[PDB]
Amino acid sequence: PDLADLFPGFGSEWINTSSGRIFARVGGDGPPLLLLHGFPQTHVMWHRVAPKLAERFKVIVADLPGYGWSDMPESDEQHTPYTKRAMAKQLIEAMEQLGHVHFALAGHDRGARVSYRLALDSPGRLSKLAVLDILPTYEYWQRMNRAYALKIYHWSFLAQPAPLPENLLGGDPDFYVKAKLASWTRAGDLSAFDPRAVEHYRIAFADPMRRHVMCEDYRAGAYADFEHDKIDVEAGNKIPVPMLALWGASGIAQSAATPLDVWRKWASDVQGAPIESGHFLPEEAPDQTAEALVRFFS
């Protein structure tokens, strides 16, 4: 339907991979910088920061596998294509299609999970890594308590076996996506968002298959993603890529643990700063987020 182009001047690319197409907006010139969104959003969440990044970088703003307009690989009982390991492999393959075998990467939310998993699996692929408002999946599950269970209830809700979350999400999908967007902002409403961006999120979320993928992602988040992280924790594997951890002063990551302290256990070279924002750093605090990312990546 009525979907605004929020990346004027960016091209739109369908990048083929062995697991399906990745949709991306591509703008800018210079070193490649891949931007990955998370839930329940699409690549358009970068629309306020991408132009500023594209002043200095070839900015590739990709829909995650299964999200947005990217193809949805068929899942399996292990949710394999929606594990962050598989998504990272698919995005690596997509970047290779562009000739980008060494790139900068900033991820937000699920996209940040892809990113740090990418950085653990294939750190050679990354010059620099920024993660916005997450802790590693293992840390969320390790710190799981009453308070976090309530706060990130959707981690266990969306990970319920199908079709339970699918059916429930189906009961009022517009409400649910708006409810997630609003409830994780500082304002608590949709006012931080561009209505046209919210329109993108609403439409993607209106598709049952897209919602199923999101549950697949969360199922992976509860199962294989956790196991993969656990392996790294237990082997002492650290991200060797210089990395920036940004978190909302009232985002999700500061609810579980002090994020820079946490990320320092996961990464050898991490800097970090809070942004006066809820979860949606690039939309609630675009100038601050864009500034931090530009300074770090450039």
Place this chain on the structure above:
Amino acid sequence: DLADLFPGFGSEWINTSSGRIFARVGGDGPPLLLLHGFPQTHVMWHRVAPKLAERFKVIVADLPGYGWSDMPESDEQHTPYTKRAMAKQLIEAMEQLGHVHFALAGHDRGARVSYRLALDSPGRLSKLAVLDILPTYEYWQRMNRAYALKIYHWSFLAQPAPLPENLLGGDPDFYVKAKLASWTRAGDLSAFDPRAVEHYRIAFADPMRRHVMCEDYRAGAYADFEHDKIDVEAGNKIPVPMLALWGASGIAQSAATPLDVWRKWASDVQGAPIESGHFLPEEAPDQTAEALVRFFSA
């Protein structure tokens, strides 16, 4: 067209300051109050209550807000659906019947009212039996990844209104049937009398009733937990002789060894597992009934 599942039981609408309590009443002898839980109504006792009625005056009540009991208006603290409030309301209901001292068996939410009744008002109870629960405090305190996945609904249903209400309203039937099925040993509805399922489904079909259940769960995440916390940290133990029954495949045994937990909460607790999922009186009626009769009797 809801079946009478208690042939020969009377029906009582018991006035309390907080609304009427519906109950079926049958039998003669010492009063025994049976309290159901979620997402059920008093009819879950229909297989065991006749055996109990051979020896006790059996009062099979709908919890405040459940079944045909009135639905006191909730508030921001979910007060009427805290187990403390529900217990005080059922104390008043029993008082209306002249029962100021009575035996009590509860299942699920009803078990939570029960042990809270026993902590708050121990002198009202001759004996207490709780079925397939641990204290609310213990469930939250043990809320790790595994358990957050198992009883995700503890955090989902406790989300602020109207999020769960809105999701549940799209297809209520699905969710009540899913919960009944998922917590049984068999993982389907075969343990239930279909006429009982229809009671549960009809209750669940009312949005107000569904809201009450969420209010119960909200109370469960907040006030109920706080009240329990006070008691645990104060070393307040239930003094009333108590039977803890749980399903070998039920929920309680997922968190911890139930008897060891209950021994922390109760000075005089005996416990037996029953080969059953969560729905002991329906999955394992003869065994449950025998356990209760034995325990409550001389």
